[PDB]
Amino acid sequence: VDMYIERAGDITWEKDAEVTGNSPRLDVALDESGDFSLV
Amino acid sequence: ETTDGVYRVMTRRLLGSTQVGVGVMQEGVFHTMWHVTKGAALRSGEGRLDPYWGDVKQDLVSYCGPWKLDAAWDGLSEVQLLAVPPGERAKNIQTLPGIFKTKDGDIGAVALDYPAGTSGSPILDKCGRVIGLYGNGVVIKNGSYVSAITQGKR
Numbered sequence: 807v808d809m810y811i812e813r814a815g816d817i818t819w820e821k822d823a824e825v826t827g828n829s830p831r832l833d834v835a836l837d838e839s840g841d842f843s844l845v
Numbered sequence: 846e847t848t849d850g851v852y853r854v855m856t857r858r859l860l861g862s863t864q865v866g867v868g869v870m871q872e873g874v875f876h877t878m879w880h881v882t883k884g885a886a887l888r889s890g891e892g893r894l895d896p897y898w899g900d901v902k903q904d905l906v907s908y909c910g911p912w913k914l915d916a917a918w919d920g921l922s923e924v925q926l927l928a929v930p931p932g933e934r935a936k937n938i939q940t941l942p943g944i945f946k947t948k949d950g951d952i953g954a955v956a957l958d959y960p961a962g963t964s965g966s967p968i969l970d971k972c973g974r975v976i977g978l979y980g981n982g983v984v985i986k987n988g989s990y991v992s993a994i995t996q997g998k999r
C-alpha cells in the first residue's frame with residue numbers, strides 16, 4: 807500500500823472567520839484502545 | 846520534503862487515491878492521528894518518513910522525531926479548525942470548544958462534523974499554533990459529532 811502525503815496549505819489563523827457550532831460539556835470515558843464513550 | 850504546513854495523508858492502490866487523513870509538519874516532524882496511518886511509513890515526494898513515536902490510547906503518532914506540538918487551549922478562547930476534507934480545499938472554521946470531562950481531567954472538544962478522512966486536521970489558537978488534532982471523539986444522541994482536541998506531550 808502506497809501511503810503518501812501532499813501539501814494542502816499553510817497553517818494560519820483566518821481573520822473574520824465563520825463562528826459555528828455549540829460548546830457541549832460531556833462526561834466521557836477513554837479505554838486502552840483510545841476510544842471515547844459517553845458516560 | 847518536510848517543509849512546514851498541513852498535509853493530506855493519501856493511499857494509492859492500482860488506480861486512484863483516497864484521502865485517509867491529515868497531518869501537520871512542524872520542526873521536521875510529521876504529526877497525525879494513529880488511526881489514520883496505523884504507524885505505517887509515509888512517502889513524501891521521493892523520500893520516506895519513518896514512525897518515531899506513537900500511542901494508540903492517545904490516538905497519535907509522530908514521524909521523523911518526537912512530538913513537537915505543545916500549545917494548549919486556554920479553556921476560554923475560541924479556536925479554529927483548519928479542516929482539510931477529502932476533495933475540498935482547506936478551510937478555517939472558528940468555534941468555541943466544549944469540554945470532555947474525564948476521570949483524568951478535562952479536554953477541550955469541538956462540535957464540528959466532517960468525513961472520516963478529515964482526521965488529523967489541526968486545531969489552532971489565535972496565534973496560529975496547533976493546540977491539537979481533530980478526529981477522535983464521540984457521537985451524541987442527535988447523530989452529530991464532538992471531537993476531542995487531542996494534543997500530545999513534548
Ligand SMILES: N#Cc1ccc(C[C@@H]2NC(=O)Cc3cccc(c3)CNC(=O)[C@@H](CC3CCCCC3)NC(=O)[C@H](NC(=N)N)CCCCNC(=O)[C@H](Cc3cccc(C#N)c3)NC2=O)cc1
Nearest residue numbers: 840841880958959960961964980981982983984988989990
Ligand atoms: N458508539 C458511539 C460511538 C462513539 C464514538 C465513535 C468514534 C467516531 N466514529 C464514528 O463517528 C463512526 C460513525 C458512526 C455513525 C455514523 C457514521 C460514522 C457515518 N458518518 C459519516 O460518515 C460522517 C458524516 C458527516 C456529516 C456532515 C457532513 C460531513 C460528513 N461523519 C463521521 O464519520 C463522524 N461524524 C458522525 N458520526 N456524526 C466524524 C468523523 C471525523 C473523523 N474521525 C473519525 O473518523 C473517527 C475514526 C476512529 C474510529 C475508531 C476509533 C478511533 C480512535 N480510537 C477513531 N471516528 C470517530 O471518532 C463511534 C461511535
